[PDB]
């Protein structure tokens, strides 16, 4: 099933090779794939471990404006976010997480809420 809109959460972690290593959180990102995935991966582990939550994590590590809702960008409609986002998001099950997604901004991890 794939409706016209769904709720999902994501964690943005730009890198040094990002199209624009700068966001509302910082203006000089020099974190490479190592430091990049190192953050996302670490976040994934804690969550799957039951120690931390993507919501709490994302916020404290959300380089994007998503940090406001701790990553949760509410319910959106197809054609709003990057293609890879919608697909992975709309392809994940209830309470699922998408692996490291490399996009213009950097590496993003999404999850299906609705």
Question: Which domains does the chain show, CATH number per domain?
Answer: 1-114 (3.10.50.40)
Residue 103, CA distances (Å) to 29, 32, 88 in order: 15, 14, 12
The answer to whether 72 and 55 have CB atoms below 8 angstroms apart is yes
Alpha-carbon distance 103 to 84, whole Å?
Answer: 8
What is the total residue count of the chain? 114
Q: For residue 74, count other CB atoms closer than 10 A to its CB.
A: 13
Experimental method, per PDB record: NMR
Active-site residues, by number, are 10, 64, 82, 105, 108
The answer to whether 1 and 109 have CB atoms below 8 angstroms apart is no
- In our burial notation (b when 16+ CB lie closer than 10 A, e otherwise), range 22-34 reads ebeeeeebebeee
Task: Using alpha carbons, select from 33, 100, 109, 96 the residue that is nearest to residue 64.
Answer: 109
């Amino acid at each position: 099933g794939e409706p016209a809109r769904v709720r999902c959460s994501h964690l943005l972690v730009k890198h040094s090779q990002s199209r624009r290593p700068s966001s509302w959180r910082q203006e000089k990102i020099t974190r490479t794939k190592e430091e990049a995935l190192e953050l996302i991966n670490g976040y994934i582990q804690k969550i799957k471990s039951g120690e931390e939550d993507f919501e709490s994590l994302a916020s404290q590590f959300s380089d994007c404006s998503s940090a406001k809702a701790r990553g949760d960008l509410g319910a959106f409609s197809r054609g709003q976010m990057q293609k890879p986002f919608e697909d992975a998001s709309f392809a994940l099950r209830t309470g699922e997480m998408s692996g490291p997604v490399f996009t213009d901004s950097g590496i993003h991890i999404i999850l299906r809420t609705e």
